[PDB]
Nucleic acid binder design. Structure first.
Ligand code: NA
Ligand code: NA
Length: 319
DNA sequence: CCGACGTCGCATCAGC
DNA sequence: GCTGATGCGA
DNA sequence: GTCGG
């Protein structure tokens, strides 16, 4: 319908992020892309698009140029620019953001092949990102996620049957595929006013599910895992595990379940009901707008009750 | 006209 | 060596 | 780049 347009805008979004380092222009173009990607008509003019929220004068102008000419002179030009296309490309490596990508390209390091010849200039994160560059850009089919989940919950329970672990993200909402695995972990002994993560990562490495570590501290692990394999080996996958204190666990599960759009509406509703919800806690707003103490939460539902909404199933939380 | 555009954990850098 | 800033990803 | 106080 409007794929020419959404791809044009997504493309522009990446050059702002990765090349111009203008994070707010990346989000402007991304949000324009989203609003158009959902508009149920073939767009005829920039003025038509302009009516949608997220589309201003400058994107209206660019849509007019695309509609009339079938391209955008500025994109054509930036696309063919050696420096910029290279910088934009390198940022597809996990661990290389806009600033490292610039630095590499400044010194002549432009390609994956170049990165491979210069391992010594790569931090640990970036080396892992390069090693699995292709695997990381693959989606994970639900079936595989179900098998990953089988392993995580088994090994977690076996370290201590009192841990609670929940796989969140779009998988928890029922998506047919996923980009990574986001595990939320708590234990009754860990509260806000209270090695729990390390023992779980350790057991997942002992059975060779976790193959690599990007980062790991007392509350957050980010790394790489692989299902056990005649068959061709499974792709390596991104898994994060976070340890959240129990009295904030369900605020965390609700947040990390999303979608983004749902959480936004839920936060809207709560405000009008005189509550403030974030990732950690729900709190009452006083008459002048002063937030008081976090309220006890023991299930997701508790949160919905506080703001007089009806428990919605992960499956029904796209908006 | 002009500021907001989430916020934070970890790894690593820059300054002292 | 210590502390706070930065880059990055989420 | 877009919105909005
Ligand atoms: Na508009
Ligand atoms: Na990157």
């Amino acid at each position: 319908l409007n794929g020419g347009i959404t791809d044009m805008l997504t493309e522009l979004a990446n050059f702002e992020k990765n090349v111009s380092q203008a994070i707010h222009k990346y989000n402007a173009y991304r949000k324009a892309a989203s609003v158009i990607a959902k508009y149920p008509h073939k767009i005829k003019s920039g003025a038509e698009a302009k009516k949608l929220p997220g589309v201003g004068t400058k994107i209206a102008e660019k849509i007019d140029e695309f509609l009339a000419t079938g391209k955008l002179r500025k994109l054509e030009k930036i696309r063919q620019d050696d420096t910029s296309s290279s910088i934009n490309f390198l940022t597809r490596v996990s661990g290389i953001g806009p600033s490292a990508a610039r630095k590499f390209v400044d010194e002549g390091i432009k390609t994956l092949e170049d990165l491979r010849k210069n391992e010594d200039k790569l931090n640990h994160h970036q080396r892992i990102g390069l090693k699995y560059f292709g695997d990381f850009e693959k989606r994970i089919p639900r079936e595989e996620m179900l098998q990953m989940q089988d392993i995580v919950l088994n090994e977690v329970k076996k370290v201590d049957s009192e841990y609670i672990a929940t796989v969140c993200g779009s998988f928890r909402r029922g998506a047919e595929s996923s980009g990574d695995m986001d595990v939320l972990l708590t234990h009754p002994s860990f509260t806000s006013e209270s090695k729990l993560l390390h023992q779980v990562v350790e057991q997942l490495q002992k059975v060779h599910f976790i193959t690599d570590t990007l980062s790991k501290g007392e509350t957050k692990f980010m790394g790489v895992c692989q299902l056990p394999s005649d068959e061709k080996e499974y792709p390596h996958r991104r898994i994060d595990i976070r340890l959240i204190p129990k009295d904030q666990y369900y605020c965390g599960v609700l947040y990390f379940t999303g979608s983004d759009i749902f959480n936004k509406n839920m936060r809207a509703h709560a405000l009008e009901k005189g509550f403030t919800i974030n990732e950690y806690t729900i709190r009452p707003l006083g008459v002048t707008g002063v937030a008081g103490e976090p309220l006890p939460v023991d299930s997701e539902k508790d949160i919905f009750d506080y703001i007089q909404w009806k428990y919605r199933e992960p499956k029904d939380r796209s908006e």
